[PDB]
Amino acid sequence: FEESFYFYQKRLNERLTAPFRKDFYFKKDTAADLDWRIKLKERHGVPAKDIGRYNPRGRMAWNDEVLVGSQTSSRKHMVEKLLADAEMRVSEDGEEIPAEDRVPVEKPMPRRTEADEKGDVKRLDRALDKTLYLVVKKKAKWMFPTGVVPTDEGLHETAARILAESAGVNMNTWIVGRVPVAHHVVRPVFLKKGEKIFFLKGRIMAGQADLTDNLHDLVDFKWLTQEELRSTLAEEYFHSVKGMFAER
Amino acid sequence: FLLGIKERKLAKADRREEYRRRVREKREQR
């Protein structure tokens, strides 16, 4: 619906926006002007490349809507037309370049990388449209980097140290702040001492985790999504950290 | 005005068709 709405609004702007004056961008009798007129002629006078063929004036201006199952509104079609137009169609001397001689433009990169296909959970470029979470196994139960809070340091100063001792210092990270975003309280057994874990949100900009020579008894790590966390973390350990999750 | 150009355009079409016809008869004769 968003694509259909954008395309629907792009044509309503064609009927209300002032026409496009090529004189203000292209000088008459130049490589750019000739290149623009040739491509404009193929688009049937429409100076835009992402609204198909539609004339805001004339006797056929009322027929602006598109029927069901149309490709013109898709994002793939929009990007395809904009890329096929970025290629020069006229040499610097004003002569049209042959069809087979035109140099195509470098196409964009695919949204799904090789990691998505391979399914490597230790890669940070996987699920580029979702938020990944660093989960580490302890010699076994999966969890986040955790540790005891000494008497000299605080909550944020302790989280920074544990992260460097567990995941190494080769990560460009930033602790959001001192406020904890979630807590998991394990009541005591009247015996065993309870635990009041306080989690601090963190964000990684670049780098990769390193478990070599870690101080804690850590074995493996993996960057999981919000959907894969509930399948890995325990029920009680997940119900307490799910409130910190985001939309994506 | 619009239909005026229409009628005057169709009128010129007949004249062009009369020229196309008559000139064709000469080409065949030659």
Binding site: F1, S4, F5, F7, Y8, E65, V66, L67, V68, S73 | -
Partner: protein
């Protein structure tokens, strides 16, 4: 192709186009937007079933259980009942045909949806005028201490609509006028019509007195009725005529 089908454009469009419901027109943005409203109305209806069953649980609950007694039990169901009425309107407020049927005057006024748009339209231009007449003509506080109209009333003399507070000729205002009323709430009630002339000059006491020119009671009215002829109040329609229509008049010299 007769007038029973609509205007010329419809009878003309209904002869050169294909027979297909308006909601089934194959348009991309129109069918992607209709699906958003479709699966939404299904959620509103799923909520009405959830809230209706919640009142049963509260209804079948001893008032003693509630810390506030029976007083706190009704204020909770009241908020629930009012919440359902809003869901019955939001389920059809986005329907494109409910708007078409209402604008064409073919809307069923017994349903909350049409009575909602009917009042929303009346409160846009007609209420602002009648509200002004009550103030500029000093109908308040003269006749009543305070008055806020809640229904529409359009009176026409001999088939001619009269503007609110318009000077009419003594000959035009000689027969009982036809009241084109319209109520916006459900149910059937008995109405009482009164026509009062509040400017009769009393020269003996140097003041004005009010005179009733018409009075009728026990007139059943529902949101489906629109026209009421004050001529036949006890003959055709049910009602008790307290005073027949008196031709309005004004002596020369008085305002």
């Amino acid at each position: 192709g007769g007038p029973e089908l609509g205007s010329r454009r419809r009878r003309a469009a209904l002869a050169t186009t294909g027979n297909l419901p308006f909601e089934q027109l194959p348009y991309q943005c129109f069918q992607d937007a209709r699906k958003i409203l479709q699966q939404d109305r299904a959620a509103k209806i799923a909520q009405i079933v959830k809230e209706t069953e919640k009142i049963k649980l509260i209804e079948a609950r001893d008032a003693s259980e509630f810390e506030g007694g029976e007083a706190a039990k009704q204020t909770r169901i009241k908020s629930l009942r009012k919440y359902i009425e809003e869901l019955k309107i939001l389920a059809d407020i986005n329907d494109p045909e409910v708007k078409r049927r209402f604008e064409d005057g073919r809307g069923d006024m017994t349903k909350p949806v049409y009575r909602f748009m009917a009042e929303r339209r009346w409160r846009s231009m007609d209420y602002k005028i009648i509200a002004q007449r009550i103030s500029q003509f000093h109908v308040v506080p003269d006749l009543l201490p305070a008055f806020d109209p809640t229904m529409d009333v359009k009176l026409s003399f001999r088939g001619y609509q009269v503007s609110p507070g318009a000077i009419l000729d003594s000959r035009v205002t000689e027969v009982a006028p036809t009241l084109r009323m319209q109520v916006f709430d459900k149910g059937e009630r008995l109405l009482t019509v009164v026509v009062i002339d509040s400017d009769v000059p009393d020269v003996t006491h140097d003041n004005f007195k009010r005179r009733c020119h018409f009075l009728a009671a026990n007139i059943p009215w529902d949101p489906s009725k629109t026209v009421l002829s004050l001529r036949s109040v006890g003959d055709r329609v049910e009602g008790d005529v307290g005073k027949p229509w008196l031709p309005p008049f004004a002596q020369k010299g008085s305002p």
